[PDB]
């Protein structure tokens, strides 16, 4: 009965020796209808801050671009880049005012500052705000957790970490019906975030299958 609005993206971000990896898929769905495969689920708030999007597309897209405006106003007023904690808490305090109204958001505020170092904050629409090293959020979060947790170590290299993030999204993209399209990679260091490309699952799956020898469930 009610209208179907865009929902989605599966996102992960984990902390490690060389900073923070952030990986997301690009699929938006309206029920079983695949609405888009080219959604930007990462918001580039500033050269040192990222925000991941999961749940309601509009809710996430609207309030995280709004969050970016509030972070800009902070550095104008305070002559200093906003802390990840403060940035996340602006968003968490905002959604808490709308608690019960029906906002649907699962976000992760990832970034680096001098005082904090690399920091990840999980923030969702029912007001939960958690600092942590590893988080997977979205409809395919469990599939991402399965691969990520079983292969995660703090002492991963930048190259291996980037791949594990990419591989974890791919795993979820494969199994979760409401995840897919393409993988967007980011690497956050002391110098800021670095974009590591858009990776279409259409080519990436077969490339990973052949090279890695995994995905033996699938007809080669």
């Amino acid at each position: 009965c009610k209208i179907k609005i865009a929902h989605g993206t599966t996102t992960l971000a984990f902390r490690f020796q060389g900073g923070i990896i952030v990986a997301v898929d690009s699929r938006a769905t309206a029920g079983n209808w695949v609405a888009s495969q080219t959604v930007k689920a990462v918001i580039e708030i500033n050269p040192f801050l990222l925000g991941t999007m999961a749940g309601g597309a509009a809710d996430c897209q609207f309030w995280e671009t709004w969050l970016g405006s509030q972070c800009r106003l902070h550095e104008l007023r305070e002559k200093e880049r906003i802390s990840v904690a403060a940035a996340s808490k602006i968003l968490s305090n905002l959604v808490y005012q709308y608690k019960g109204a029906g906002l649907s958001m699962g976000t992760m505020i990832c970034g680096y500052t001098r005082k904090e170092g690399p920091t990840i904050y999980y923030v969702d629409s029912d007001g939960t705000r958690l600092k942590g090293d590893i988080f997977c959020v979205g409809s395919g979060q469990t599939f991402a957790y399965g691969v990520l947790d079983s292969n995660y170590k703090w002492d991963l290299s930048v190259e291996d970490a980037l791949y594990l993030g990419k591989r974890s999204i791919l795993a979820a993209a494969h199994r979760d019906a409401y995840s897919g399209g393409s993988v967007n990679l980011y690497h956050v260091t002391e110098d800021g975030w670095i974009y590591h490309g858009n990776h279409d699952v259409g080519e990436l799956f077969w490339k990973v299958k052949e090279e890695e020898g995994s995905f033996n469930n699938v007809i080669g």
Binding site: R27, T29, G31, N32, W33, V34, S139, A173, H174, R175, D176, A177, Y178, S179, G180, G181, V201, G202, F205, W206, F215, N217, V218, I219
Partner: protein
């Protein structure tokens, strides 16, 4: 809790010049969870091909049921059942469960061995026959398949050309449906040879 969209899947059938094609995806899931990528939805009894979408337990049950019935048919009739006759058998059997139906969307495809005429047909869950010259579609991406077939299809396609059309119709329809895809199979059917091709498609 909608039986026809728990497992997911699609089937499409087309006619060509002295040939028919029937194709299906390979996904079997439980709502969002993809479970199997080897679940074929096309079966055949002699030269008559049957594709079935919908609730997977009923897909399996009906295959077993029609194998049962076509085997007894052949023993008593001393000949293979024809597509026109089989179509009627499917309709009878589905309507027998009118008020407790199999949650399926079957599709018959084949060439009549006597006349040589290409034949396709579709059904709703309670057995209503939908005959067509051009194409039949079924499954969770039926809307998508209708749009693809209606634009891509032209009459009297050669087997080699028909393969490209039906494959492109299935693939691009499946890629716009969450519960369909995970592989695909295409049957090209000529008068006395049948080629089966597995398509390469995106696995998300």
């Amino acid at each position: 809790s909608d039986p026809s969209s728990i497992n997911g899947g699609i089937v499409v059938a087309m006619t060509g010049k002295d040939c028919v094609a029937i194709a299906c995806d390979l996904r079997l899931g439980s709502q969002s969870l993809g479970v199997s990528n080897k679940f074929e939805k096309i079966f055949h009894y002699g030269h008559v091909f049957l594709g079935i979408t919908g609730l997977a337990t009923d897909v399996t049950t009906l295959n077993e049921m029609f194998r049962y019935k076509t085997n007894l048919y052949k023993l008593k009739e001393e000949r293979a059942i024809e597509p026109e006759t089989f179509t009627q058998l499917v309709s009878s059997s589905l309507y027998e469960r009118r008020f407790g139906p199999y949650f399926v969307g079957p599709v018959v495809a084949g060439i009549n061995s006597k006349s040589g005429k290409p034949f396709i047909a579709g059904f709703d869950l309670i057995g209503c026959i939908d005959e067509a010259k051009d194409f039949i579609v079924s499954g969770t991406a039926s809307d998508q398949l209708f749009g693809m077939c209606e634009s891509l299809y032209e009459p009297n396609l050669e087997p080699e050309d028909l393969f490209e059309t039906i494959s492109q119709a299935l693939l691009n329809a499946a890629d716009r449906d969450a519960l369909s895809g995970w592989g695909a199979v295409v049957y090209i059917i000529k008068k006395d040879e049948v080629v089966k091709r597995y398509l390469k498609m995106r696995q998300d």
